[model samples]
Target: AAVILESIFLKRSQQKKKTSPLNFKKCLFLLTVHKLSYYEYDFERGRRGSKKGSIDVEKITCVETVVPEKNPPPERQIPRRGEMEQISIIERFPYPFQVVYDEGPLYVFSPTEELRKRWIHQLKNVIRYNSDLVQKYHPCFWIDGQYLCCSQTAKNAMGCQILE
Candidate 1:
């Protein structure tokens, strides 16, 4: 409820400033991520109803590897400048990812338990969400309660790897 109250307060503040809602969204994005045009990207796994959602994850293999969803610095529109050279992998993952790009092919880091493959794809869809909502969720928010992760991008622990 604290977030709801905070939102209400912010709305009242906006009313006082005579600003439109769209202007407020711009301000919030800039204040949080320093970008006004980039939308937060999320993933969606089409695996909820399948047996995989309830079983082991190591067996779920569609593609061996997915495109490394690069987290390039926010460029509203890259102007299609082909001359721009790419950088390292770490340099590619965006900063402060509230949601991961695609979740199925995802891996968790060590000091943890095994990841479930069946659910990964379905869970991936939620992560695959593409909108400001992906970034705006209270950092821990997922579509459901089962994930129970602190950040949308759960840290890579030592024991985790994709189940390909």
Candidate 2:
């Protein structure tokens, strides 16, 4: 029956419920980009909290999002006193996505998919701007992947530089 199948599904989902301190509860998520630094502040239940953290946009190699596992991996059991225990491998479901940075232990998440897209889009824009701000600088002696020969007593050392 439809009701029977629905009941079974609800029970299984409830059993998988897990919580972490980092999880937010209907808080306002604020993302601010000042110069080269990225910042996030969570206002929990309409109360201002301390600065969560900031990341230097110049140092950011990449940014992405991940929907975490509903149920974490089970702990391994050691064989004790010849008791047989079968180990079953399992995969996790991806839900409740979080924005991940390359350089921190911080994870920024939202309960809505629209907010996630906005946050991710903003981060990508900053990264692209950073790339444009700087380029690879090479010394005057190096040209086209070749080094100018600087040995003394070589003919036309200053007039014409030889590639090596």
Candidate 3:
């Protein structure tokens, strides 16, 4: 298959249930003609690790930017107060973008605005012919059991603003 885009991104773990803790990890993402796949990024080794996730390109409904959180959640906040140590997703990877599909949105953070825009543009170009493209999308983060943009609790809830 033809490669569309490939880069390292910080991906937010998919919420398996309402009680699941939000986690973020660095991943090497590969976008192709058939699907978008991500792998654990080995930063020290400077290579891709095991396969982590994949999303069919045709299943994507919307691709858009996410508004930065005014007050980032504990999971996204920098400088842990306790013994736990973690890299701040918001602090380092601030340019976030989402890919919405039937399963829900996949939130990925890019290191720079240029990379984020390029990814969104390429993704939108590939999914342009999809049959079920969405007309609206949530522009903000889903936090503390609700979507910051729409206050919706459901993960797969329809978006609040019209997609551009």
Candidate 4:
């Protein structure tokens, strides 16, 4: 599955019939698993499994900073230079945002001083995980963070999703 996920990047390649996010990403992940033995891709599980690629993973890239074993979290992380308004996700909040990614768990990319600076300035929103949506879709790792949903009143204030 991870091969397919990774292959989404390669949809422009000659092997693919068309550019479909679903088909490409899924094929990319699976083929990479079979051909490469899984180690060639993601770094987090270079040696964890005696079993093999269950529903748990589908490799995208390895040796990237997002993985905790290699890059690890920052000592004093903060977003780049924007308040909530500059970002799309947190902008939905009535106020600016602050978050600390839970790296100790499965690990997340945010929560580093360097990444914070990059993410806050360059991107406008963190991916969110609404619990009800998790099992149906890929893990939306950042969705669990503290956020103010749109209540929208002097008595109530909350953010709205522009994309939604």
Candidate 3 local lDDT, 1-164, one digit each (tens): 98788887889987766678888887889999789999988777978899998999999999999986677654433332332114443236667899998888899987666779999999989999999998999998887678989899997898899865
Number of the predicted model whose lDDT against the real structure is largest: 3
How accurate locally is residue 129 in candidate 1, as Cα lDDT from 0 to 100?
35
Native-vs-model 3 lDDT? 0.82
Superior candidate under lDDT, 1 versus 4 = 4
Every model: Cα RMSD to truth: 20.3, 20.6, 5.9, 17.7
Candidate 2 C-alpha lDDT tens digits along 19-82: 4222322222344453222223232453334533445655553344442433433221211332
Task: Output the TM-score of candidate 3.
Answer: 0.83
Clashing pairs in 2: none
In candidate 3, where is summed lDDT lowest over 10 consecutive residues?
76-85
Q: Which ranges of candidate 2 are over 4 A from the true structure?
A: 1-29, 35-47, 70-105, 131-164
Q: Where does candidate 4 stray beyond 4 Å? A: 2-45, 49-146, 149-159
Residue-pair clash count for candidate 3? 0
Q: Which residue window of length 10 is worst by lDDT in model 1?
A: 4-13
lDDT (Cα, tens digit) per residue for candidate 4, span 88-126: 321111111121212111112232234334433322221
Tell me how candidate 4 scores on lDDT: 0.22
List runs of model 1 lying over 4 Å from the truth: 1-58, 64-90, 93-164
User: How do the predictions measure up, each by TM-score?
Assistant: 0.15, 0.38, 0.83, 0.19
lDDT of each: 0.21, 0.31, 0.82, 0.22
TM-score of 4: 0.19
Superposition error at 4 for model 3 (Å): 1.8
CA lDDT, candidate 3, residue 162? 89
